[PDB]
Structures are given as structure tokens and as C-alpha cells.
């Protein structure tokens, strides 16, 4: 019950898998695809890529990113990333997933973002809980993207 703050924001959706292996402390995130992304380019679509940050207590611990897809609002990635999070630490971290529009000049604008893990809610909490309940199993789920202003206020 709960969450859902991004639902009416019309930014798009992202699908990713989560897998956690407690003995090894291995957390794997596979960025699968995004859909219905907000159009960001004047007279165009978007050039989306995805950033994945591991966070704790407002601190960005590790940063990864996908390749850039050109001229699409429905990119497919299928790109895997892993983090080392020991089992005594896994309930205390966040994984933050941001979709951005690439441009060769200027700060790239976020389309929207979500996070799973500590302090997550709604479908975000559900995905994380499903990961934890099923050691070694990859669990794929869709998430609604939310405006950066709101998500960052929750992360800070
Ligand atoms: Sr662009």
C-alpha cells in the first residue's frame, strides 16, 4: 500500500531486474527497457541513457551508466551492472535509477528517476522486498519515473 508519487507526472516508465546473493554480497541490476519517455529534444524525441547509483545516507557510493540510445522514447538496453553490498548492509542502501537525455553540450537533463531499497515505498518497496525474499532469483519489474525534485528530496 502507498507510494506512487510519480504516477500522474507522465515522464515514462523503466523496467529493470534486481538480484541479490547474500553469501557473496552481490547485487545485480539489469536495465531492460524504458517506455513512454517524455519528449526532451525540440523538434525530436529523446537520446536516453540510464544512470544507476548506489546510495546510503545521502551519499553516492558508486555510479554506473548505460550506453546512449538515439532518437527514441522507448529504448531497449539489456545492460547489466553489479555492486558489492555485504549482507549486513543490504537493508540500508538505495539503488537509484535515472533516465536522462543525452546532449553533447550542456548538463544532461533528467527525464525522471526512481529508487528502491531503504525508505522506498509502493511498487519500489515491493520490488526490493521481492528481491530480498528470493535470494539468487532475478526479479524484473516496471516502475513509473518521478520528477528529480521529489526523488532527490527523499534521498537527501
Ligand atoms: Sr537529446
Quick one: cell of 23? 553469501
- Residue written as grid cell 517506455: 35
Q: Rounded to the nearest whole angstrom, what is the distance from the C-alpha of residue 34 to the centroid of ligand 1?
A: 15
Q: Rounded to the nearest whole angstrom, what is the distance from the C-alpha of residue 98 to the centroid of ligand 1?
A: 15
Q: What is the dotted CATH code of the domain comprising 1-156?
A: 2.60.40.150
144 closest CA partner among 61, 34, 56, 20: 34
Q: Which residues are annotated as a binding site for Ca(2+)?
A: 41, 47, 101, 103, 109
113 C-beta neighbours (distance < 10 Å), count = 25
| Rounded Cα–Cα distance for residues 122 and 13 (Å) | 15
Q: Rounded to the nearest whole angstrom, what is the distance from the C-alpha of residue 62 to the centroid of ligand 1?
A: 25
What determination technique applies here? X-ray
Helix, strand, coil content of the chain in percent (nearest 5) = 15, 45, 40
92 C-beta neighbours (distance < 10 Å), count = 12
Amino acid at each position: 500500500s502507498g507510494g506512487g508519487g510519480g504516477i500522474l507526472e507522465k515522464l515514462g516508465d523503466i523496467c529493470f531486474s534486481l538480484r541479490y546473493v547474500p553469501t557473496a554480497g552481490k547485487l545485480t541490476v539489469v536495465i531492460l527497457e524504458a517506455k513512454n519517455l517524455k519528449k526532451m529534444d525540440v523538434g525530436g524525441l529523446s537520446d536516453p541513457y540510464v544512470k544507476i547509483h548506489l546510495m546510503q545516507n545521502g551519499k553516492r557510493l558508486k555510479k554506473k551508466k548505460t550506453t546512449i540510445k538515439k532518437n527514441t522514447l522507448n529504448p531497449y538496453y539489456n545492460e547489466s551492472f553489479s555492486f558489492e553490498v555485504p549482507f549486513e548492509q543490504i537493508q540500508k542502501v538505495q539503488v537509484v535509477v535515472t533516465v536522462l537525455d543525452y546532449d553533447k553540450i550542456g548538463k544532461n537533463d533528467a527525464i525522471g528517476k526512481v529508487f528502491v531499497g531503504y525508505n522506498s515505498t509502493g511498487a519500489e518497496l515491493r520490488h526490493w522486498s521481492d528481491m530480498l525474499a528470493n535470494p539468487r532469483r532475478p526479479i524484473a519489474q516496471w516502475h513509473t519515473l518521478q520528477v528529480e525534485e521529489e526523488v532527490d528530496a527523499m534521498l537527501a
